[PDB]
């Protein structure tokens, strides 16, 4: 056999690519059954030489707020549910303890008795942006060790990632759509996946990734809850998340960084009454007031509506593309790149045709048409806003939306947003 706790020979050729290169502290509310209290320094918990050596190389000093509490929790083989939007070091909060256990316990007898890749740990992410950030920090801490990480994501060459996987992966970072695609090709097996991490689970649900995430976790060879160690990270906490955290976690601990609640902030919501005849006019005025290069996403409810609306905006001179299924994958994936960088800063789309597509973080979401469920509305307006700047979500309301009047109202009050006075007088 072999050993996975002794650092391998270094290579000065490799330090160059990895270590070439912030707030303070904020309140925590760690509610859990019999959880271990946090730590103050990395030297407190004996994580391992391969980790400690790599910690120095990136000039890591003190563990961040979430890293103080989450790190001792994970290495104690306890499921975690961390809800923290204004928390720095959310990604390294799980990488250090997970990799510390893999270096200690080893890969397990199943892998060493072998010579389709079976990764030990799996990290799910919503965006290609966040997937690579986790992957590049994984490389930073898997250096000088026998763990090789791999990343896959949608909207890229699948053949080059397959060639990357076959080179051997133990810690895989993936978006849910591309991971399911790898599994159907017999390239990835979750049989020996011990550590599961769902990073930014809220934004993963807003993009329509749940059927994949449940296909990955609940409908394959993924070891069951209790056998695997599962962590979750998210900013919001709707009914969708707590139900998901109930199915995916076994007797977990809840972490909180100050402001913790459903309906992410940094998103200003405006609701206006617009009859169907005036939606075109109202949208035009809404676009004439738009910033110079502010990216805008316009949801509609049908395929015919999305085509007719995109035709409207093009005949008015606005640079806009569309995605609505009736245009094949050659035009849809082209619309992303055209929208991801100027060119067509107005993307008309439907709720279904945007499922799992990494929209380039829009600045203004416009619900030209409204759905029939308040949970879909949370998904759609979740396409805007980040951990930093403030976003905008305008929604056109009329008599076709009495169904969601009460739910939209209470949602606005919970989000501390302005409430149209007539909306109260409709419930
Ligand atoms: C508030 C910051 C945030 O929201 N996330 P982040 O900026 O992506 O934080 C991770 C980046 O900062 C570096 N990092 C993470 N943790 C530490 C510690 N403890 N010391 C020094 N640097 C840290 C990571 O390298 C990552 O780039």
Residue numbers in the entry: 133 to 153, 162 to 255, 264 to 575
Question: What's written in the study?
Answer:
Named for their conserved Walker B motif consisting of adjacent aspartate-glutamate-alanine-aspartate (D-E-A-D) residues, DEAD-box proteins are required for all stages of RNA metabolism including transcription, processing and splicing, export, translation and decay. ATP binding and hydrolysis drive non-processive unwinding of RNA substrates by local strand separation. In this work, we describe a chemical genetic strategy for the specific inactivation of individual DEAD-box proteins with small molecule inhibitors using covalent complementarity.
To better understand the binding of AMP-acrylates to ES DEAD-box proteins, we solved the crystal structure of DDX3 (132–607) S228C bound to AMP-acrylamide to 3.0 Å. The overall protein structure is highly similar to the previously published structure of DDX3 bound to AMP, with a root mean squared deviation of 1.265 Å, as expected from its similar thermal stability. AMP-acrylamide can be fit unambiguously to its density and clearly binds cysteine-228 through a covalent bond. The adenine of AMP-acrylamide maintains several hydrogen-bonding interactions with the Q-motif of DDX3 including interactions with glutamine-207 and the backbone of arginine-202, as well as pi-stacking with tyrosine-200. The covalent linkage significantly re-orders the P-loop into a conformation that to our knowledge has not previously been observed in nucleotide-bound structures of DEAD-box proteins. In addition, the phosphoramidate of AMP-acrylamide is also displaced more than 3 Å out of the phosphate-binding pocket as compared to the phosphate of AMP so that only the 5′-oxygen hydrogen bonds with the P-loop backbone, whereas the phosphate of AMP typically makes numerous electrostatic interactions. The significant flattening of the P-loop observed in this structure is likely due to the torsion placed on this flexible loop by the tethered small molecule as it moves to maintain hydrogen bonds within the Q-motif. Interestingly, this distortion of the P-loop breaks the electrostatic interactions between the phosphate and the P-loop backbone, which are typically thought to drive nucleotide affinity. Nonetheless, we expect the reordering of the P-loop observed upon binding of this compound to strongly antagonize the closed (active) conformation of DDX3.
